[PDB]
Design a protein around this ligand. Structure first.
Ligand code: HEM
Ligand code: HEM
Ligand code: HEM
Ligand code: HEM
Lengths: 155, 155, 155, 156, 155, 156, 156
């Protein structure tokens, strides 16, 4: 059986993935509705990536004889325009990585090194998303909003 | 022999398709003349799609032993710039979908379910065109008119 | 800008093409409705050919800074049986070639040699259609109406 | 579980399909026996098409927990010559589409939209058959009977 | 012209084939509905084989200048569970082969050797079906009903 | 062309049902995989994917109609504790889903939103196919016994 | 021998082609130097097309037993920025087509129909270049100069 606090941490990370799946999927379809197809496609792939993380977390929790929690869905940060949507994704990711670091600390302490390795792989993927997000927000500043949107119309 | 009012409704839809064929073809060639080749190509494909709908309507009318009316051509809405042309297409499509809905109501009432199915397929295609048009008009607001035209110069 | 009377002549030829498109398309679908698929298929190709001429005329008018007229649709000559439909097509083409010759005369007078060359190419296509029509009407006389229809049932 | 009257309508349409299978299959083989191979082949495909509709109806009735009725075979309309055979097929199809419309009305009323969609697909196929049949009868008038039969001796 | 009693015999065998087509097709679709897909698929192929026999019988009757009887449909033996359905198929086949033998005797007596050969080919197919049916009923005894059904779940 | 306000409410209701089914079927899939019932785990995975695709189409339709898709409200997951309960939980969810779909289609018809009706009818056919699978599986447990049924679903 | 005035007209058109070859080639390389590679590539192709017209005129003059004049090079219209370069090309083409029409009139008058056909083919190609140039100048007005240049930085 797994450590009770490891399973709590894994369920907390899973909860964050479930928010991100839905937030990124809606943002993707919003961008597609507006004709910003390059943003819509990239955001769809971000949503798929979170779906795959959730899958791996669910599988680990079950192996450890815990109960995966897919019932509690936290608050989606839905923006009303491109700049707010990107900032909402970044705010979500900054919370996501804080929780990941706390979970890894606990895994190391109780010697659950396989759970730590899984979380470290998720953390790397979220830091890559932060890299993308900070880059997009900087580009809006460097080229202007209307030029940035123009750049993201075509796939 | 088909229901007389069904044939009248089908000839009304056909009349709307005939307006749309010519309006979209002219808009296409105006955009090509101006060097906005992406818009010209998309609009050509819209005109072709209306040609295919008119064909299916003609065939259905003849099967029902009615007389297809290709003689009466209503008013083309020709715009003077890119935004107005898109808005003219949208005004035409909003009228077309109203007429399609009224035609479908009558087909259902007289149990002409095959005519209804044909009209619903056309209606879905016209709503996809509305989706394109509202998206383009929204992009003009979001990226600016000159940027929008810039994006539609090359195929 | 193009010559004002050249553009009027090009719009007149365009109007003739627009009549022919619809007349041949309806005749095609009537023959298909009747199971005369060889005639229906041939007439369909005649309609497509007039569509392509209309396109070239629209493009030339716009280059010359004129306004293509797709709004005014003249009288369709719709037959009620095969022999009448063929004679109607022949009557329309004889009017078309008369107008083409008058347009070519004017283009030569004002030295619009490229418009003349475009119109000469259309004229050759219309004379090929006259060749087909006169041949079909001659076959009806040579084999009889029922044998002619029999020959045109299968594609 | 399915609506009882929906299941009754579906079995009624199934009964019509079972008549058409047999009528078209026999007309097909009669035309082949006479050397009118183009007619025989087309009529064979109409029979196969009805077999597929009957299959989908059987499958739907079973899903809805009804009993498919393959026991009751109504009256086959068999012609004695080509012109009669085509009119017999047309008469059968006109009855079939009347029954299809009444079944669709009832499915709509009780919100069985999937059964309605199946019946609408069958109806489109039967109306295509009416188009073929009315066209053939029109051709007999336009070219004459002997020329029409001549046109249908060889297959495509 | 064919012998009158040969034509009666052929119409009787055809009548048996028409029963089997419907009985096997219904049994096939019942097994599919229950998820016994191996039984459903095999029973489908049995129905198709009887359809082909009916076709050969119809063609022979017409060649002999008889009237094929597709109007009279005898009693379908429909079971309520797998063991009853298999026994119903066997009962039908035992009657079918009895009738086939009587038809062959009469064909031999009147020297209709081509009709005899066709009927013998059908008889061989029906005995192959009896072999299948007796083998399945024996397997139910040897492995038990639940194991037998388990074996026929997957195609 | 703004959507009917009640149409958008119905579409958001169906979307909410799809979101429950995605999570319920995904968890059931991974439970069956954890238990080594790989054939059930794989089939249930594909059911979850199918609901994801329906949710996508509903989100797209709502946005086109200028509504706000609701991905925030997640209703109650019906999670079973063994194979037979899990299948019955899926079936209970699907019966509720098809009831809501029928009511949404009724309203779409009333306000002449025929494209939304067609989308919902396509989803309805897919959910009725899932009901077919589930009722068949529960019938097989009764026909072959629970242990034989589980044995049959160990290997993919 | 050919008609003396026909040969003079053909040499006049040849002279116009020789100006255009050099003007378009230099404009092409100026655009490439500035990093406006789409304009540079298009203008290179315009220069090649004029070289091919010059070739056909030389061949026709020699067949007619005239002397092709490749010695006299008239005034190149070289712009100092993109907008001036396009207008310089347009000014040259409007002069070229005027001379082409005058040459065709004369060929018709003396019944040199093959020379007329050659000149009409050149005229169609020059009117296509006018179409391109007017469209580009219009695009500058519709998108603004900086956006137009932006659109022409990268080749296809
Ligand atoms: C202003 C009037 C029209 C113009 C300028 C026009 C132009 C065209 C052109 C350029 C094509 C492509 C031909 C090719 O290159 O193969 C085409 C195709 C076609 N047109 Fe038209 N057309 C017109 C009216 C119509 C009408 C009134 C109908 C029917 C009633 C129609 C039916 C069709 C069909 C069925 C095709 C083939 C589409 C496909 O399957 O790809 N057209 N048309
Ligand atoms: C007089 C009765 C029938 C005759 C003579 C007949 C004849 C045939 C024949 C010759 C074939 C083609 C077999 C092959 O060579 O592959 C066929 C196929 C088929 N039959 Fe029948 N049939 C009859 C009744 C039925 C009935 C009552 C049904 C269903 C309720 C049915 C369902 C089917 C199906 C589903 C196929 C396969 C069609 C395809 O997918 O191509 N048949 N039939
Ligand atoms: C518990 C939440 C979810 C989980 C665990 C999950 C899991 C997955 C997985 C594992 C895949 C396959 C990824 C791959 O390897 O390519 C997938 C695909 C997909 N998901 Fe999800 N998903 C969830 C929620 C959602 C939601 C809420 C939506 C839409 C609103 C959605 C839409 C999609 C779509 C469109 C695909 C691609 C399906 C295809 O076309 O093949 N998913 N999901
Ligand atoms: C003055 C009279 C000229 C004539 C009659 C002439 C003729 C031609 C011809 C016939 C071609 C081949 C075209 C083809 O079919 O692809 C050609 C190619 C070419 N020309 Fe000229 N040309 C002339 C002047 C020039 C000048 C002044 C330049 C440069 C400053 C030039 C640069 C080129 C280049 C780079 C090619 C392509 C060579 C290759 O890479 O194959 N030409 N010319």
């Amino acid at each position: 059986k797994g450590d009770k606090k490891v399973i709590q941490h894994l369920n907390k990370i899973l909860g964050n993935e479930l928010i991100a799946i839905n937030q990124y999927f809606l943002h993707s379809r919003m961008w597609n509705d507006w004709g910003l197809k390059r943003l819509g496609a990239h955001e769809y792939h971000e949503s798929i990536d979170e779906m795959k993380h959730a899958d791996k977390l669910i599988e680990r929790i079950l192996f450890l004889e815990g109960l995966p929690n897919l019932q509690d869905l936290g608050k989606l940060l839905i923006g009303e325009n491109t700049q707010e949507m990107l900032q909402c994704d970044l705010n979500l990711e900054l919370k996501a990585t804080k929780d990941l670091r706390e979970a890894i600390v606990h895994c190391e302490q109780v010697h659950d090194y396989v759970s730590r390795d899984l979380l470290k792989d998720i953390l790397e993927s979220e830091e890559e998303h932060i890299d993308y997000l900070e880059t997009q927000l900087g580009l809006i500043q460097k080229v202007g909003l209307e030029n940035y949107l123009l750049s993201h119309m075509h796939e």
